[PDB]
Design a protein around this ligand. Sequence first.
Ligand code: NA
Ligand code: NA
Lengths: 405, 406, 71, 75
Amino acid sequence: VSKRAVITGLGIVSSIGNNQQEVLASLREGRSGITFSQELKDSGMRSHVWGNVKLDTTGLIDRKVVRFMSDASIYAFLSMEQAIADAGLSPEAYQNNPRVGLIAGSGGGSPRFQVFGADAMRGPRGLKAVGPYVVTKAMASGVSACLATPFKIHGVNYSISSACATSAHCIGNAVEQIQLGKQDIVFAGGGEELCWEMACEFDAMGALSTKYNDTPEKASRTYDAHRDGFVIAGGGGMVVVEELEHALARGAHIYAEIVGYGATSDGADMVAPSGEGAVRCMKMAMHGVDTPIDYLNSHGTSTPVGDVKELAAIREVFGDKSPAISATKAMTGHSLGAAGVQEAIYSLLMLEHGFIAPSINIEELDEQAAGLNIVTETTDRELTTVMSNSFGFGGTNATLVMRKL
Amino acid sequence: VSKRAVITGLGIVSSIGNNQQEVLASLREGRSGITFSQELKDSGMRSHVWGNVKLDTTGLIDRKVVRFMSDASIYAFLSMEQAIADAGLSPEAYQNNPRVGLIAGSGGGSPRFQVFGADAMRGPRGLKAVGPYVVTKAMASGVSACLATPFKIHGVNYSISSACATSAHCIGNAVEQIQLGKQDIVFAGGGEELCWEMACEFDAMGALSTKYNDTPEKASRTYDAHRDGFVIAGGGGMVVVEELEHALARGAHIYAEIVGYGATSDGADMVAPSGEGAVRCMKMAMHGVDTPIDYLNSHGTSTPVGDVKELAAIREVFGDKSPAISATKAMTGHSLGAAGVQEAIYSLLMLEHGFIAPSINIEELDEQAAGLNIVTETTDRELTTVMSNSFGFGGTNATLVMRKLK
Amino acid sequence: ERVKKIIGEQLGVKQEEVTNNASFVEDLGADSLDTVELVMALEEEFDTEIPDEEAEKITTVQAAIDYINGH
Amino acid sequence: STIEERVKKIIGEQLGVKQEEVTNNASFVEDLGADSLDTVELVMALEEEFDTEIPDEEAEKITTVQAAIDYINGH
Ligand code: NA
Ligand code: NA
């Protein structure tokens, strides 16, 4: 048969909460996670705001496994611990099991330890100050390598990278493993660190918000007429993707079923999206889905260009049946490699608890956004099918459609 | 039913050749691509040998396209240019086609350009001297993003990273895209750059060869009793993975059919392989292949411990029916994220041309290696099924099986 | 005045449409990321410094040649 | 603190064991569970702490807690 896939557990460490309960409270109240950053100012950048993880990680993970971990792997490790416990998976149910895998990736490893390794080499110590741990912290598959070992994953294990669509492709790839009958359980997610080494190059391109440094909570302002760039952010996320019959037999709590997954490419411009690729990506995820879309978690970066190209794609897909739209990035910032799994978790919390989080910081709706139902205040509503878009540098697109059973 | 995947074209830029003709010549002769590196010595490293790409890339890529590229993306682009022509494909057939995708990743991205931007950020100029092309060059998805735009790919487009199993997982996930019926053509492969900013991290762990800096040609010595670490290398590779009926429709040249793909995780030690995961990975790829394995391209890489552990996994899977074994890394080195697709192309050329590349530099065969057919000299033989293994940090494994159509 | 050579290799033209009123966007097809690099490449040939709010106004080719003759 | 207990402090936090388990005759590998990579970082932390430089040929000789104390005491 076709084999169906469901979500049986989730875990999140973002700028608006260290778990799904704290995230649920922030989503309802529309509380921002953007704060002032002294590190971004001392390094010489123009943007002084970020969506930081308000949590110290010193000592939370065992020494034998944290010695190889950068911040991206740490946030994803703490997220998977939550997802394992939320799914009720005992150790003998997911450890040393060939039918259990992991697909988690980051945007680009850890530039912090990349720069640290070169500084120690050229120094007076030489190789004596480099250390034998920079390789696992700086590589691209560090999130998957540092997590599959302590959790004793025996199935599939690799990392996916695709700019800001990163963790979205990981979830879609997990659904494919379940559909192909290769796996019964796949942990899917990702993480991202937050440092000046990685954020400074975004500022050199002129894509970060530099006009709202004195009021950080107003910097991320998606769909507003006075936007000037996205706010850098970090964190992690993890979802438990399970085969349907495997989850029903063990009495698991099922959040939703992933009934659609789109993944296309623009193949036009390197920095500016075209729109045609996003339509095919969305239309691909809706094919075979009979129920309409109730809520749409847009990619919404809060950039002067990429914000309108997604609205034109949404308009062509639905036309007059415009679903409720809101961009949660206005609260949390842009977590890059972890944006796909974090926004899918926000959408699952909306579907689970029957509400729509608002797209905050909208003082004057942009003219090219009129006619759409952009929700600006928290609304209680029985949602059935939700959708989340994730676009990435290079024209790559990803879309997930989730529905209750 | 189940859609079948075949290889209809290939391209490679490695340390033993800049196309499949040069590479074919080095394989039949046994020429090592390892040379002496003055940059590795100037930076203060203990290892002074590597497998570099002997090729000038000035003017081979357009300025509008190369400005976003790092060396890992340049080797993959030049490899994809050869694979498209080798497949006989025209832009009208693969450009602006939603059924044509691209899955190509790198081991990490580009440490050299990340370090260059940090030094400029802390320099006297500051943010103004960083430049606007550091993001595209230093990100982990640079290989796929810098390639999908010039070739106008409309299908799937992302990068897979899994240490030294990177480009093998890319090929495996390309096959899955065809099996699920989501794509007709997927370009799969990867690339890796070669610089001291990346190699000096492996020298800190003691994983590089430092005892043969005077004789670089015999530094990488897989299965020899006097090995002391792998030799770092770079390059790129790309294969055209295509659905069977689509390839037979346009009368394409088919190298071999991907009849098996294995992908497992050890979940034990992260720096030392376990062998148990390798046994499951080989059996999963051999599932359904009634024909025996004629040649096995081992991962090898001339590491003090991981060499003998892989051999025990081969004996457990094959028993008395051991296939011919040779580690091509003794010639080329370890290209990290490009090794999977490059060792897959080496196995394809050997299957296509009917021979076995030798495992060179073996002077004293080590213990528990006796009992297997480690082919030391170039043996001409008609093959029908080959196998290439690929392991990586984190206990991750990948295995591909290729067979002629008959 | 070797400015025409740098601009030619920076934008991807055989050095032809180099008039006073030639914009970089609609005449020379320069990306907005290229306009930042166009500035950058001018400092490598002559050691000079340009602020930020002044750079957005600069979108002419003859202005670059005249700026160089005066610096 | 004495030289002996400054080394024992370093070994404790680098390998992840209690100070009581760090006795003099204890070896790093079989007693304190130090893998091959832990030995490299351990000698780096000793040579970052007493401002001494350890040759690699002698660093491989240091396999016990007493051997590390004897080397620092002798230099
Ligand atoms: Na979204
Ligand atoms: Na191999």
